[PDB]
Amino acid sequence: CSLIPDYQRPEAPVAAAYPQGQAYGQNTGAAAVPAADIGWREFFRDPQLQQLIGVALENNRDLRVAALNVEAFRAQYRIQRADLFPRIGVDGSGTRQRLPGDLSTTGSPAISSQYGVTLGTTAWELDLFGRLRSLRDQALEQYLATEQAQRSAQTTLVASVATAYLTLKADQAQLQLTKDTLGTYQKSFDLTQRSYDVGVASALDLRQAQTAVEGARATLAQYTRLVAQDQNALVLLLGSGIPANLPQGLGLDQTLLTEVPAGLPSDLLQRRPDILEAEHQLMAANASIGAARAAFFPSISLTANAGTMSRQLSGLFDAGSGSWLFQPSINLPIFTAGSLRASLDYAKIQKDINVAQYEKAIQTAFQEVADGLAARGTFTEQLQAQRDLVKASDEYYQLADKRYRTGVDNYLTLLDAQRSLFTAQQQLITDRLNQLTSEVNLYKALGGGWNQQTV
Amino acid sequence: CSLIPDYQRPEAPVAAAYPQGQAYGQNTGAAAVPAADIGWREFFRDPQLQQLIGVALENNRDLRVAALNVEAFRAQYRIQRADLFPRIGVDGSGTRQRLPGDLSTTGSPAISSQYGVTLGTTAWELDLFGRLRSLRDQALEQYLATEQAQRSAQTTLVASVATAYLTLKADQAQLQLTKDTLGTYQKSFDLTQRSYDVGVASALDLRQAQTAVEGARATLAQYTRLVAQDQNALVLLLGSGIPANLPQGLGLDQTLLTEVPAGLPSDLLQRRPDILEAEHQLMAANASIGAARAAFFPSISLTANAGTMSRQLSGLFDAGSGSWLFQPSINLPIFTAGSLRASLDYAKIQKDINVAQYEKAIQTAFQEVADGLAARGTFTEQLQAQRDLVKASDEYYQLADKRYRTGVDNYLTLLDAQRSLFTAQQQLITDRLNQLTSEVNLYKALGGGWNQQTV
Amino acid sequence: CSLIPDYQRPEAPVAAAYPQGQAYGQNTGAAAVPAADIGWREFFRDPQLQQLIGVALENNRDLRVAALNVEAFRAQYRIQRADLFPRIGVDGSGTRQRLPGDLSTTGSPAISSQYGVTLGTTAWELDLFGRLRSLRDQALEQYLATEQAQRSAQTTLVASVATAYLTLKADQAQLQLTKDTLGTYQKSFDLTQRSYDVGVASALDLRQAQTAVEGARATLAQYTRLVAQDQNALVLLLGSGIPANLPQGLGLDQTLLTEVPAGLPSDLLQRRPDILEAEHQLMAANASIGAARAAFFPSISLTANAGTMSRQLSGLFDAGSGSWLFQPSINLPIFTAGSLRASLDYAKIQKDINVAQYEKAIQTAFQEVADGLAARGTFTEQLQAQRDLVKASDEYYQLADKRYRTGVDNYLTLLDAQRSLFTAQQQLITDRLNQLTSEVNLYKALGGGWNQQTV
């Protein structure tokens, strides 16, 4: 006679399609393969980043805490599963007592000493009504909830290592462009110091060129420390240090990522691990309903023992000294003060709070995926505009070079065209860094990379 | 006799007046109508914002978690109140035992059955020294603490919906200005393309106009993204989507929300919810002192019982079989190994943990209110300087338009003046967003939006 | 017998030296005096900041919570250490029997009773195989973990008050320079208003003068707001107000601090506090697996009595009415169905979890220290570039002042030169702020805010 109630799936409050507008693109229907099935070996193309994630899934320690928390709750489920069963041990019953002359058996103050070992249960409570069954069911639901949360931890780790590597590549490209702008400012100050010695340029243009060079040196040192900062952050996120023999990974100009189907908002309820973690927390509260409801009914205990008793220790292995104890007990609360109804509606409160936790998880997951959809809809237009800016600034540089080569234009204006080209490329690097990090965050938000390859 | 210690509250470490200087305003005297009295309908002037609070206030999930955690701790208080009273029920306790020949009555190994069903209690205590009653009002004051926590959760919900809606309107106005800057850049590029196709302008300023247009299209894609992400954030924070029948929402430069009287710093000790939460955790710590003190005094307990006992199982109809037990049980710990000093010491240490927690909540409340007062004091000067900036740039554009319409300058300088006026309007909208965000956080920090009208 | 397993030979999860690159200067090798025995009075040369740290230590409330948590775990260690020693305490027992005539010892249904007062113990277990010994060892090592957590809280509080005071003083300097820029713009607007009222400059130059002045007055109000917010944040981090009798502090130009020798990565895990509290949580997990391994063994328990009993109230303290009870019990389980095995596995997994958290703590310490070393290596050459920029703009301003005093250029070009000099000093002051706040963060990351008294 089990008393866990019938499970009822809570409805999702999310509308059945991802939101439309001027910033989004056109959605598709159901996908043959969702995002939670293409692994981090196919979605991540370049070999260096695949080797870094293959290192960081093993050497990092937060994923190790996640997997060990899973195996800890294996042990914690095994506790309750064995608590459903007896504990067949021994015990030693020894009562050496002194009573007055009125209370004893001899009519005199006497020291009586009966002591002898015996095996059997120590108040083993048998489970007629399903309260121990529902406690181990709660333990099993908590176990597989946390082994869904381990997949959620691996998802966040793969996304964080990917964003750390992409910011490392983009920030060392920024460092190279600031080094090149420092080179052009140094050449312009060299020419202004040359024209200052001869006498064409006054000392005001010399001080202006010197302020420009010192600003470029400050920018160069700041990007040097930023490369050091996010390289140390990647050393943290890999667990171990960066290995030496990494392959020549693909730069930012190639297609570093693959296309991912968005799908339906109702498809997300079975694939993202945070959703299906909060769902099994809700099933654990569903088992706690039965754990609190199975207190109203008669709980049955057993106390059995079997072993030899004696008076002296010397005559404990002989004939006629066998013994055995059998003691059942039933128990039924006629009128408590309201602790059982308080435990029942407290379990119902925990059930509805975990309903709210599951539904909040669906809402935040839908918001993160709609964030990723809006960014994937707008960054293609932003980077098309930015690459047209880079191409127009490069054509302006080539025309300033073509005016310089024939002689009608100075070298300082050619260096101004070089620095406007480098400002255009420094903007392009950061816009593509924002595109790639939001693409990785969208892949995390849909189903994440838990499988290694496509299944 | 009860044993809970008497409680006077700790005084506030923060000053008796809000800070003064060049940033703040003059101090108001007191509050006849304080800040927590004014509801969100007599504070928020948008009917759209009133409808969005009316949706989000009962259709959220985290506020639902708080409002059900209140019910959870009422269930825990019902547990602790019901454990004052005995466990009056029915039980049937049979013992079948084998005894060896030395321990039996007749001297021969035989059996002896004790099959008797009884009614009554097992091991309940009455504490006339005040241990269970101190645990009872500890549970009561944890309930009062978490209902104050529920009020603070609704307060932060109201502040977050208001800030998300104000940033949504500000990003709408940002997008409507970025479309016009893109219009003026595209029109200036069409003029330079016509000037290039005839032959007046070179290719260099044509590439400059192309880079300007592509910068405008990049920032247009960025603001479409940012508007879509802000709508997704407000879909998260309402709980459901934006509903259908929204009324008219007024502008951003009008009176979006009325002024709030600040009052004294001591009025936070009664109006603010989180300070009252720390207050009730402090008096629950005093109740826990009274519980962990009352174990020195002797506990009086008894296991009352009344039933029908017999050797045989089939019989209880006899008139003489009205069996009953009384069994009182009184204990007294006279000298342990310093267990009870350690328990009383740990409870007193928890009390002056919660003292420090209480005045740390006071100090963070005072800091949030003082930053809100500084924002009130400085944003009037900043926003008036910003409106004078916008008036100056508007008059400059009007004079450039008069200069163009008479015929002296061309249309490119008119488009440059128009872009300067658009940049001034953009910075005005950002500063007004900052003012409204800081005053919503000030209203959140003073007393919050709990009730609607007066009591 | 004790069953706590042996401690393991430590492997390093880190390279044996701080990294090298363009940012990193050069390793200093090992150090004689580490970074933890440099107290905050021989490190912070600023006497005003030293009194501010003194107020922040004897007045803030997070240190009250931390030191009171250490006191709470002293009480918890005593309440778990006291479980070895026998809880002896005089008590009072009694029964009042109603057995029927089938069950009575005489043959008629009668009333029987047996009561008495006995000095003795109740269900005391003798810790023969070290389970409660292992639990008090666990409580002792969690006490040491709580003490190292208090040391970590104190060094982070010293760092936070140093950085808050430092940003306060730097934003005082920022407010003073933007008040000077507002002065120069107001004087340039006075000159342009005269040059308009006479007739030379048109109204468009007057509108550029107004847009400059209103931009500057907006930024002046913004920095008054920001100084007020940062001073209220410093009031939060102190817990008490700024005291009145402060000495004259040192400005940001001269050395407020000195460089602390970093050393090797091998004395982090001896000097840093959070690594040590992770180490003591690991030791507590070793004691937990000691108790779990001792759980297989037989757990002997005892009761005892030395008092008197009788059946009558008026004669229980007569001669020869003494009583005495001895109750030994050897108890070992044989069949546990995988419960004690499961709790053993759960404690081994707690050991592995605390190993992983200790190793994570070493990795986060190494990452934060390496970021501090990056900042120390780069901010020197960046600040040299910034000071050369300020000196070149100051020479440019001296040349523009010579051109003004002779009579070649008007006063508006000198105000343009002051506009450039002031923003040069703006960027210099915020860069020196970044250097000093990252130096304080490195000093926290090596873990040296603890000692003021002797060792």
Author numbering:
A (entry chain A), B (entry chain C), C (entry chain B): 1 to 455
Q: What wording appears in the published article?
A:
MexAB–OprM, the only constitutively expressed pump in P. aeruginosa, is thought to contribute significantly to drug resistance in this species. The overall structure of MexAB–OprM is a vertically elongated rod shape, ~320 Å along the long axis and ~110 Å along the short axis, and the stoichiometry of OprM, MexA, and MexB is 1:2:1.
During this analysis, we identified two modes of binding of OprM to MexA; accordingly, we determined the structures of both states of MexAB–OprM pumps at resolutions of 3.64 Å (state A) and 3.76 Å (state B). Hereafter, we denote state A as the 0° state and state B as the 60° state. In the 0° state, H3–H4 of OprM face the α-hairpin tips of the LC protomers, whereas H7–H8 face the α-hairpin tips of the SC protomers. Several hydrogen bonds are present between main chains: Q104 in MexA binds to A203 or Y411 in OprM, and K108 in MexA binds to G199 or G407 in OprM. Also, L100 in MexA engages in hydrophobic interactions with V198 and V200 on H3–H4 or V408 on H7–H8. Moreover, the side chain of R403 in OprM extends inward from H7 and seems to form a hydrogen bond with the main chain of A105 in MexA. These results suggest that the two modes of binding between MexA and OprM do not differ significantly. When OprM states were separated in single-particle analysis, the ratio of particles in the 0° versus 60° states was 45:55 (in the absence of drug) and 58:42 (in the presence of novobiocin), suggested an overall ratio of nearly 1:1.
